[PDB]
Design a protein around this ligand. Structure first.
Ligand SMILES: NC(=O)c1cc2c(-c3ccc(C(=O)NCc4cccc(N)c4)s3)cccc2s1
Lengths: 10, 274
């Protein structure tokens, strides 16, 4: 249900 | 000798802050490789090899950690082009990154989280023993060799030579960065690494990272969204101490009661991955 996402470096 | 003929270039695997990474085969022996391209104009951190050749810091750090066997993806070769560097890296097959693994499987069983976390600790200790600070430990930067049950660290593009003095620069992932970086733009290498490992362990046993916002990182409150043993909660809360001096050493992490009786890599593959 809850949004899991990648996170860019920088 | 030229890159063109020494490797067969396959399709893209991914791109981002790191560069552009293609599947590849070494023709001399059909070894599976990853071919990583970095544009010179995009590289901010430069170093020198023993012979004083000017190279991306990434090549300096990879060469320091790539001697012998470890939980790090090894640099097999590199080439300079007019506008870029090309890095030839190991490619396990079959492989999945730990980010995709956790997305697909959800929160990992503690036995599996213990095996994965232990292997990441051994890999990070290897880097520190070689004088290298990764500075971007996260699930996205960990490959799983699904047949061997072996984890491999990737992307040293945000890394530095390990020092005992303060760091005032950072280009890693903000949601894995410590509160002292958020608040004061200062951190020490080892204690910042331990913070990122707390974030990673929470990620493994809860199925996502604990913090998205700066206020959460500095707030010092860890809410468990999944069932997690008291010993595992204790280790996570200790790694995520707000004061860097209150965080465990790598020795204290690996001596923690939660970390005892780890599976071997092959047991991990047989029980959880096969
Ligand atoms: N970067 C690096 O230094 C390296 C990456 C690799 C890789 C891979 C690139 C991405 C991979 C992936 O599983 N996700 C694909 C994927 C999906 C979605 C987004 C992104 N960025 C990637 S596998 C394999 C072997 C050696 C290296 S060294």
């Amino acid at each position: 249900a809850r949004k899991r996402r990648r996170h860019p470096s920088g | 000798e030229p890159l063109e003929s020494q490797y067969q270039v396959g399709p893209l695997l991914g791109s981002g802050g790191f560069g552009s990474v293609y599947s590849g085969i070494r023709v001399s022996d059909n070894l599976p490789v990853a071919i990583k391209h970095v544009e010179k104009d995009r590289i901010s951190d430069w170093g020198e090899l023993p012979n004083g050749t000017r190279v991306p810091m990434e090549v300096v750090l990879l060469k320091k950690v790539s001697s012998g066997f470890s939980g790090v993806i090894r640099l097999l070769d590199w080439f300079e082009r007019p506008d870029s560097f090309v890095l030839i890296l190991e490619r396990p097959e079959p492989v999945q990154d730990l980010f995709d693994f956790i997305t697909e499987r959800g929160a990992l069983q503690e036995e599996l989280a213990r095996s994965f976390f232990w292997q990441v600790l051994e890999a990070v200790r290897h880097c520190h023993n070689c004088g290298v600070l990764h500075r971007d430990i996260k699930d996205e930067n960990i490959l799983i060799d699904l047949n061997r049950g072996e984890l491999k660290l990737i992307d040293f593009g945000s890394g530095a030579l390990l020092k005992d003095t303060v760091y005032t620069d950072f280009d890693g992932t903000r949601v894995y960065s410590p509160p002292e970086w958020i608040r004061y733009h200062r951190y020490h290498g080892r204690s910042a690494a331990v913070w990122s490992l707390g974030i990673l362990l929470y990620d493994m046993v809860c199925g996502d990272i604990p913090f998205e916002h700066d206020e959460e990182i500095i707030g010092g409150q860890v809410f468990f969204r999944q069932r997690v043993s008291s010993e595992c909660q204790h280790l996570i809360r200790w790694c995520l101490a707000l004061r860097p001096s209150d965080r465990p050493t790598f020795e204290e992490i690996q001596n923690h009661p939660w970390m005892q009786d780890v599976l071997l890599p092959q047991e991990t593959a047989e029980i959880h991955l096969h």
